[PDB]
């Protein structure tokens, strides 16, 4: 059997011993059968899933709520009293309440169980595959590049200037350097001296590494520490504690009102038992005992609906601030535009204009100069630019797939169209200066493969303003002349003409050494934008949010794209990158609400901009994707990391990520969050309206005479129907398309507004008026009849049902939506109707409850009169929509 060795054993033993003991191939790797055997033997590369849930313990913990315990105490002291029906009814009712609370808790636990398995790169069968870190087995060959995180315990056998961040493991802010040499047995006392082992969960900052898996899952003390630190957390949502405070205030007000009405009923009154029972009923009915449950389940359904649309968001409280945003920055490449570059226009230093046809990275296409087809080395000016773009290239084309930068793949395809694919191997690359964000140029110094006696030739490419600083001469009609200022102005004007059409400009120069280069020409690398982003950005800035652009390119093409998709209003400015560099946050904070395009910028500037965006009243939505951009995401409130082109540093230490990079997904998530908030507001509105109506009805009933026709069991059933399946049906709801045009909700604003208060008060007074009308119409000279109680109970039930029906959406009436789209509402409605009809006619229940019989014409009159609240709500909604239309028409 293969033994599992610890970290110190792999540290003290050389690479040969750790390879022979583990039987791991450094170059070939392990086979599929051996990997499957090791996975079946040692298990999966995850923490031990040993967690049992005593569902019976949860069921009994659903008890002990003081109010239901006082209800059970009343029930048992009633058993002591010479009576049986009230006791058994109260016991069955409290049983239904406990089981509905338990199933609600189980559903909330399921929703809270409802982001991703972490992927990695592994070398198996001699090939590198992008596989799951969960299926990793001890002995696999793992490659770690910049950005990638260490999946499991790794024994380093190859390392190039590797620096790994271990602050999450030991707390040191300084990354330690890794080496492949074995450490002596004397220095293995502390953890910081272990520079030959890559531990699980560590973050690789820089460098490259190739190691062998030695420890997975449980076979690591650091793995145990991680399992115990990142398993039990409690990141409560600000909206959650806000709703908790609101519910506590409502409960305190309800308890005060109940104490007041009890003091009133005690004076000039008797039958203390019924008063205490009805007080307990009002206490269990008025208070919201399901607000956290419904808010959690609606947040979970919202996050599930938004991840269904390819939008993964961690840090659940972020869903609270999702949609509250008002400034959403974006980059040109990636989110706002697909990563596809195509060379279309070529401008040589001689003044020639060449057009390149064909779309895609293939050999299909031709170069036309003044009507003539240029192939091979027919035109010196064009062929020089082609060879300069080809010899200085890091991307490679294979089976129409590009490996590297797409901007270099564009020049690769351009050389392919001219039949110059085999030129890149004709030169021997000697010196390389790669393309960096600070220098913005890439240079290669090479010699010919068969003409090594010739002087070394260096080719530089990049931005015009950076390349032209190294150019001293130019070519015209085959003659090398000196670069005058007029030639520089002509080149700048041509760059402006190219940028005005939305083409990325790229300058190229060639020479014997750096500093005495001749400038060959410019190329127009067009970038087709994604389809559908135009209308999205149009409807985004039309109300609420404002989109920015951090491209890092020149101002010309940036403004061209921002005008094509639509970002530049008549009153808008644009700032450079050197302007942000030589300026503090205070002076910048006064020009940010006007600027919308950031050209010639860099991620190093982004953080600073964020500070300015944090100076005034606003919240940031960044879109960092590459390296050295995770700190900007952490400093901002939320950070949008891309899935395809995204490192692990900017993925795990970040916020909501977007797979299948696009721009409308943020808008969809914003609409989802706003719909969640609207559903929560509608549920709170319905609950508060029903509670206020019941409280004022009970008060007007027990005021000075004519005691309440609603008994304890009836009010408890009303509580069940107010906080049951028809209650949470309002929380979960498919959103319509109206909130994207609404202004964003401020963080200072609460969930209760003036119109909501007016609506709940109108609903309550209508309920009370209808109930009093029914009470007056049922009896004229009759003191007390059970038919009166039945009529009042069924009337209040039907009124609550119609009020819940009218409370489907605060911005949409019942006519626009149908009897679908969360049909669970209609399911709960029909279930409650069946339960009510069973309560009406059931001889075994007629002794339990108060209802014993009813008439058909009485039921018809009840359904005819109950629609008053519904018609009033629809009338006020129609007049509000008419006022909205007449105010937008002017
Ligand atoms: N491989 C490269 N060689 C030389 N110059 C480049 C290369 N790639 C990009 N550039 C230039 O450097 C600029 C900066 O690129 P980057 O900072 O990655 O932003 P973006 O790619 O979105 O423009 C580009 O606008 C382009 O002019
Ligand atoms: F892809 Al960029 F700045 F937009 F590096
Ligand atoms: Ca209640």
Author numbering: 17 to 130, 134 to 909
Paper excerpt:
Secretory-pathway Ca2+-ATPases (SPCAs) play critical roles in maintaining Ca2+ homeostasis, but the exact mechanism of SPCAs-mediated Ca2+ transport remains unclear. Here, we determined six cryo-electron microscopy (cryo-EM) structures of human SPCA1 (hSPCA1) in a series of intermediate states, revealing a near-complete conformational cycle. The overall structure of hSPCA1 is typical of a P-type ATPase, with ten transmembrane (TM) helices (TM1–TM10) and three conserved cytosolic domains: the actuator (A), phosphorylation (P), and nucleotide-binding (N) domains. Structural analysis revealed that the Ca2+ coordinates with the side-chain oxygen atoms of several residues, including Glu308, Asn738, and Asp742, and the main-chain carbonyl oxygen atoms of other residues, including Val303, Ala304, and Ile306, consistent with the results reported by Chen et al. We also found that the Ca2+-binding site in hSPCA1 corresponds to site II in hSERCA2.
To gain insight into how hSPCA1 recognizes Ca2+, we successfully obtained the structures of hSPCA1 bound to Ca2+ in three different states: CaE1, CaE1-ATP, and CaE1P-ADP. These structures had resolutions of 3.59 Å, 3.52 Å, and 3.71 Å, respectively. We found that the TMDs were nearly identical in all three structures. The hydrolysis of ATP and transfer of a phosphate group to Asp350 in hSPCA1 resulted in the CaE1P-ADP state. The fact that the cytosolic headpiece remains open and that the TMD remains almost stationary in SPCAs during the phosphorylation reaction CaE1 → CaE1-ATP → CaE1P-ADP may represent a key feature that distinguishes them from other P-type II ATPases, such as SERCAs and NKAs. The N domain binds an ATP molecule and rotates ~57.0°, followed by ATP hydrolysis and phosphorylation of Asp350. This leads to the phosphorylated E1 state of hSPCA1 (the CaE1P-ADP state) with little changes in the overall structure.
